[PDB]
Amino acid sequence: MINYSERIPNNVNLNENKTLQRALEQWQPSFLNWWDDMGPENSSNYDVYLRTAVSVDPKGWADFGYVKMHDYRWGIFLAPQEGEKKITFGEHKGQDVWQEVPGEYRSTLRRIIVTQGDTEPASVEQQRHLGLTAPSLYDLRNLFQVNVEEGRHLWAMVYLLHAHFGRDGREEGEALLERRSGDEDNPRILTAFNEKTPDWLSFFMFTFITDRDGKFQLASLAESAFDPLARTCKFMLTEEAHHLFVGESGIARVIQRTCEVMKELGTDDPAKLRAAGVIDLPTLQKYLNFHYSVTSDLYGAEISSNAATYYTNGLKGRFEEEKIGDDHKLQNSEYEVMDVAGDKILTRHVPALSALNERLRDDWITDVQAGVDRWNRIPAKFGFDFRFTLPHKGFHRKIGMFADVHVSPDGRLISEAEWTHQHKNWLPTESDRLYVHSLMGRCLEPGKFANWIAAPARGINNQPVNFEYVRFNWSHP
Numbered sequence: 178m179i180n181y182s183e184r185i186p187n188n189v190n191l192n193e194n195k196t197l198q199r200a201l202e203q204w205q206p207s208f209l210n211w212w213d214d215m216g217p218e219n220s221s222n223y224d225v226y227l228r229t230a231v232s233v234d235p236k237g238w239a240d241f242g243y244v245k246m247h248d249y250r251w252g253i254f255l256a257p258q259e260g261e262k263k264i265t266f267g268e269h270k271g272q273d274v275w276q277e278v279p280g281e282y283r284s285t286l287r288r289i290i291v292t293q294g295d296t297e298p299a300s301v302e303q304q305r306h307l308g309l310t311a312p313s314l315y316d317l318r319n320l321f322q323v324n325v326e327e328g329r330h331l332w333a334m335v336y337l338l339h340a341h342f343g344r345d346g347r348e349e350g351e352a353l354l355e356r357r358s359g360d361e362d363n364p365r366i367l368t369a370f371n372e373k374t375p376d377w378l379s380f381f382m383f384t385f386i387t388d389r390d391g392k393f394q395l396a397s398l399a400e401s402a403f404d405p406l407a408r409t410c411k412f413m414l415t416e417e418a419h420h421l422f423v424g425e426s427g428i429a430r431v432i433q434r435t436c437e438v439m440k441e442l443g444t445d446d447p448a449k450l451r452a453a454g455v456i457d458l459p460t461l462q463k464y465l466n467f468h469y470s471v472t473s474d475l476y477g478a479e480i481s482s483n484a485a486t487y488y489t490n491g492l493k494g495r496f497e498e499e500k501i502g503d504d505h506k507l508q509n510s511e512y513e514v515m516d517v518a519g520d521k522i523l524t525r526h527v528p529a530l531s532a533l534n535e536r537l538r539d540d541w542i543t544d545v546q547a548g549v550d551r552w553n554r555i556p557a558k559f560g561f562d563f564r565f566t567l568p569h570k571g572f573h574r575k576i577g578m579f580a581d582v583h584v585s586p587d588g589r590l591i592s593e594a595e596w597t598h599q600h601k602n603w604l605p606t607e608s609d610r611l612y613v614h615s616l617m618g619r620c621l622e623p624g625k626f627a628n629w630i631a632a633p634a635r636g637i638n639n640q641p642v643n644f645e646y647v648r649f650n651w652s653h654p
């Protein structure tokens with residue numbers, strides 16, 4: 178490892194700003210208390226082989242070593258500042274990007290930053306029980322790496338709050354530790370982040386699908402005229418890519434194991450696959466349906482004056498804004514969205530500014546579909562017919578125009594009776610979830626993997642797959 182240096186590694190000259198540094202250090206012990214309370218369960222004395230960034234360059238990014246998570250060096254890292262960067266969209270296109278928050282947008286920027294910050298500890302809270310049933314040291318270590326990274330994402334947003342929003346900033350930093358996933362009176366802001374993540378199959382789906390909402394929200398904010406936010410999100414995207422990998426390869430390894438048992442037993446009978454302790458592909462498809470549809474609601478209403486305002490004011494851009502071939506102002510542009518009118522799902526064009534949530538949702542759908550295309554290479558290579566698919570965008574939605582109807586995965590509007598009698602085929606049943614639960618059992622033997630999942634293609638940081646990625650320090654409970 179590179180030589181220790183700073184208590185809070187950073188590339189923002191934190192030490193030069195005494196007032197700001199003091200505010201973060203006053204908040205730190207509160208963060209550490211939250212981490213001990215709501216962080217990975219019973220993990221206080223584990224030594225975990227973790228990656229820590231200590232500077233933004235490739236070498237400093239990849240500082241691997243054993244560390245207790247309580248002692249993780251959470252830091253603050255902005256993509257390098259560019260000389261003479263201009264705003265790329267909206268009313269202010271062509272002007273210098275902002276280094277400070279414009280008073281007129283203070284409350285909106287604050288809202289955007291806090292809502293993003295809120296999802297980071299929510300994922301840790303949702304996932305805190307999982308290590309008790311980790312299917313391998315490798316997977317246990319990946320879970321912990323995701324967790325400390327989401328912890329750092331909370332630091333990333335709290336830094337912006339303290340640095341740019343004064344006393345309100347600090348009050349937002351405190352409340353971010355007071356809310357709690359699933360709590361009755363102070364729940365987390367967004368509904369999908371108040372859901373349970375009850376097993377490892379849900380965990381891999383969540384990091385494959387819901388961390389991908391993180392990618393598309395962060396990619397939109399990485400375009401912001403408010404440059405400290407833009408540069409914060411650009412760096413965060415490198416960590417988000419790791420989360421997406423954990424999710425995609427996690428499910429890939431599960432599909433691999435189930436295809437192996439299908440080949441061995443020579444059957445696709447789910448009763449027989451389950452007798453052999455694997456997760457049948459159809460059940461995997463239900464979990465895909467579930468996490469996909471719940472995540473889709475995170476993009477918000479298809480039509481929205483708020484999203485239009487964020488774009489025009491230069492706060493939040495479209496995904497890969499600069500690659501888009503239009504005027505980047507959209508006053509006379511359209512975008513095609515669906516609509517529901519009685520017994521018909523139809524299409525219409527609306528003003529582009531009013532449908533930016535739907536555009537972002539569509540970008541995310543395209544990305545998810547690419548990952549699903551990659552999973553499908555597995556049955557294909559085994560010569561099986563099974564293919565995973567994404568359901569219609571209107572299936573199982575609680576936000577927006579499809580909220581008041583039922584749509585089947587194959588895109589029909591369906592009756593209440595048909596939803597009630599058939600959705601057991603489309604979303605995990607209580608019984609499906611009990612079966613998956615029945616398979617969850619810790620496996621901490623080095624190089625060994627629980628029977629429902631295959632080994633990964635390679636280890637971490639060139640270590641053998643049977644490396645002791647976690648040391649439990651059992652003598653010191």
Ligand SMILES: [Cl-]
Pocket residue numbers: 283284285287345
């Ligand atoms: Cl404000």
Ligand SMILES: [Fe+3]
Pocket residue numbers: 297326327330391
């Ligand atoms: Fe995150």
Ligand SMILES: [Fe+3]
Pocket residue numbers: 327388391416417420
């Ligand atoms: Fe993430």
Ligand SMILES: [O-]
Pocket residue numbers: 327330388391416417420
């Ligand atoms: O993330």
